């Protein structure tokens, strides 16, 4: 089929915010194929070449002082403006997770099993999940998948407990997320 | 990352010889919006975003023009050095815990690849399924590779198997990632 060579140009404007908008750093980056050639760092104040491929540009652009002034002022005219425009639905987005507890595979008692706590559909990504056996925190057989980005502004996580269930035992998955005031608790009775 | 840090990225690319352009905004890894070069309209990733913010897509067109012109220059300046194909990693997950006969979504996550061209097919029981399917645009990564999400709404049953077929110039053969209900 198609074997023709490919050539890729990427332009990235990164606005980094610290303590709300107390500190702002603008970073403009030009990437040829998979190599950054030239960048403007607001902490430097001028374009700098990363590779030889970018040296002429860094020179040429660094002679346009009107350009340099607009780029040094973009930390307010561009970054802070966009932060303010989107604060309501980005930095302040809170979606509550759904928590379910289920055995990974169906098997008899007194036999090793994997208890799954599914925490799904939450935003933002900072979360805390703990397992308890009859009220005591299990920190030994806990296997987590980590943060899974679904691509629709939601996260999910599977936190699993290695257990040898016995009749009467109660296992509990407790989750704390910035979207709920009180911990979410789901139980599974062996 | 740093709990007090937040990042907004404006990511553009132009790709030759495909003559493919892309203009999008990203917040902490999630797409806020992109400009569809066809229809010439701003597309917000979630609907609520469009109720507090707006963007005139025509201006983005201007940027893509500059990018095109710049690419054709840099290509010449590099003595026509082509891009190295980096094959993607493919994963298939579900949006939520699977409950038989209750609607759910299969997610095909394509990660760590370049150039940003990929052919994705959903297959139910070996046959291509195309109804209800969605996809994001190419999402930027800091190593300057790309991510992509493909979505297939489905009704979980014990009688259906699913596959995500991914084709990329860095793979020797098309890659099928398999999903089944296991119980």
């Amino acid at each position: 089929g198609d074997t023709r060579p490919r050539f890729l140009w990427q332009l990235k404007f990164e606005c980094h915010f610290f303590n709300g908008t107390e500190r702002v750093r603008l970073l403009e980056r030009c990437i040829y194929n998979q190599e950054e050639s030239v960048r403007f760092d607001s902490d430097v104040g001028e374009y700098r070449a990363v590779t030889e491929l970018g040296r002429p540009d860094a020179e040429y652009w660094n002679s346009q002082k009107d350009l340099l002034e607009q780029r040094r002022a973009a930390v307010d005219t561009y970054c802070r403006h966009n932060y303010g425009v989107g604060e309501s639905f980005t930095v302040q987005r809170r979606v509550e997770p759904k928590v379910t507890v289920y055995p990974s595979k169906t098997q008899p008692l007194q036999h090793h099993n994997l208890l799954v706590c599914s925490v799904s559909g939450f935003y933002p990504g900072s979360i805390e999940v703990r397992w308890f056996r009859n009220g005591q925190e299990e920190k030994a057989g806990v296997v987590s998948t980590g943060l899974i980005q679904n691509g629709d502004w939601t996260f999910q996580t599977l936190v699993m407990l290695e257990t040898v269930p016995r009749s009467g035992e109660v296992y509990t998955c407790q989750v704390e997320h910035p979207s709920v005031t009180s911990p979410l608790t789901v139980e599974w009775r062996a | 990352m740093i709990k007090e840090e937040h990042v907004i990225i404006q990511a553009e690319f132009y790709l030759n010889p495909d003559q493919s352009g892309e203009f999008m905004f990203d917040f902490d890894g999630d797409e806020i919006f992109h400009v569809d070069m066809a229809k010439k309209e701003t597309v917000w990733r979630l609907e609520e975003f469009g109720r507090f913010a707006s963007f005139e897509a025509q201006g983005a067109l201007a940027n893509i023009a500059v990018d095109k012109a710049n690419l054709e220059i840099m290509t010449k300046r590099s003595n026509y050095t082509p891009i190295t194909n980096v094959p993607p990693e493919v994963t298939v997950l579900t949006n939520s815990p699977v409950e038989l006969r209750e609607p759910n979504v299969l997610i095909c996550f394509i990660d760590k690849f370049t150039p940003p061209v990929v052919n994705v097919t959903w297959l139910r029981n070996g046959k291509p399924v195309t109804t209800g399917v969605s996809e994001t645009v190419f999402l930027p990564r800091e190593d300057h590779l790309f991510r992509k999400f493909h979505y297939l709404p489905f009704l979980p049953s014990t009688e259906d198997v699913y596959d995500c077929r991914v084709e990329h110039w860095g793979l020797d053969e098309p890659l099928l990632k398999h999903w089944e209900f296991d119980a």
């Binding site: 332009l11 404007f13 403009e28 030009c30 002429p56 540009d57 020179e59 040429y60 652009w61 346009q64 350009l67 973009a74 005219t77 561009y78 403006h81 966009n82 303010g84 425009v85 989107g86 | 404006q10 553009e12 905004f25 469009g50 109720r51 507090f52 913010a53 707006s54 963007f55 005139e56 201006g59 983005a60 201007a62 940027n63 500059v66 990018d67 012109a69 710049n70 220059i73 840099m74």
Partner: peptide, 15 residues
């Protein structure tokens, strides 16, 4: 609704 701003790229040196 408020308007989201975008910077524009600069033309590269055609030396």
């Amino acid at each position: 609704t408020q308007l989201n701003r975008a910077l524009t790229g600069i033309a590269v040196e055609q030396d």
